[PDB]
């Protein structure tokens, strides 16, 4: 079998980043990159406006707050259901951060996902936020089950 | 291995030889088996009899 790897497209016409196009490919509903690019640039323009910074640094700061160090996988021996803590390799750190941004942004509920994703980035920047519930709860699950490694 | 008692020609092991028995007894206090000390069957039997009698006169330990 063995591991297979994938690719992704380098630029964005505003905000020339790899990972911002990685978020563009994320949150795509039904094969519509156009709607996700419009939502994304209107959200990052809100993040540039409402806080007087470039939204790249706010976005990476939010990522740094969300990216979990420790997943806790499963290892069932007998009838035990043990969970085993896993040091996450940083690709999965970035992709779990992007899933949690996208999922809890559209799960929040405001008068566009422009505003929802923008306010979720603004909350994950000033660390208290909705995806950071998942960050904290995964680190608490790894902290309690640290006896197995 | 090689036997000790065949080498020095010595017969009945004579419990009074506390230093020789102290050589055969292990570090914790146990008797070392025949594949460690290299003796015969007969000489290992007389060795273990010797060590048990010398234990009952406190010439040899039980536990250390």
């Amino acid at each position: 079998k063995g591991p297979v790897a994938k690719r992704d497209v380098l630029p964005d016409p505003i905000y020339n980043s790899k990972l911002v196009s990685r978020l563009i490919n994320k949150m795509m509903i039904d094969g519509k990159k156009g709607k996700s690019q419009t939502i994304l640039y209107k959200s990052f323009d809100i993040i540039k406006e409402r806080t007087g910074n470039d939204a790249m640094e706010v976005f990476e700061q939010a990522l740094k707050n969300i990216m979990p160090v420790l997943e806790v996988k499963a290892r069932r021996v007998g009838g035990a259901n043990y969970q085993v803590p896993v040091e996450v390799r940083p690709e999965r750190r970035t992709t779990l951060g992007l899933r949690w941004l996208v999922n809890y942004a559209r799960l929040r509920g405001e008068k566009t996902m422009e505003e929802r994703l923008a306010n979720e980035i603004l909350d994950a920047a000033n660390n208290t936020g909705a995806a950071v519930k998942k960050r904290e709860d995964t680190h608490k699950m790894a902290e309690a089950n640290k006896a197995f490694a | 291995k090689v036997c000790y008692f065949t080498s020095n020609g010595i017969t009945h092991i004579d419990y009074k030889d506390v230093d020789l028995l102290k050589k055969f007894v292990s570090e914790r206090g146990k008797i070392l088996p025949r594949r460690v000390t290299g003796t015969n069957a007969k000489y290992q039997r007389k060795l273990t009899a010797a060590i048990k009698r010398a234990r009952q006169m406190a010439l040899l330990p039980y536990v250390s």
């Binding site: 035990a80 640290k146 006896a147 197995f148 | -």
Partner: protein
Amino acid sequence: IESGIAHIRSTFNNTIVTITDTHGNAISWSSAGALGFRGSRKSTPFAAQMAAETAAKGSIEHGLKTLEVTVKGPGSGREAAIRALQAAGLEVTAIRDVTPVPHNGCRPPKRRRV
């Protein structure tokens, strides 16, 4: 005091560590269940590490610094508890691996699946 002996008793459920005084006077004690783990997590060597940490914290009041650790009971948490006494500010000099060995003695209770 400055010197004492650390009795670790790690059995298949619990790893109880009591740091006592040389003619047997317990300065402080903590178990794997005393730390809070109630389930099967009592058996993990992390709880033995935590129990050695708490016993080390309790021992350094009126105090003591250089231990002499006696491993008792057939378990798992002996190595982590010896290492965790070192990393909690104490010194572990001798290691007496003394589990109570009967020669022949009493007969054990029956094997389990029968």
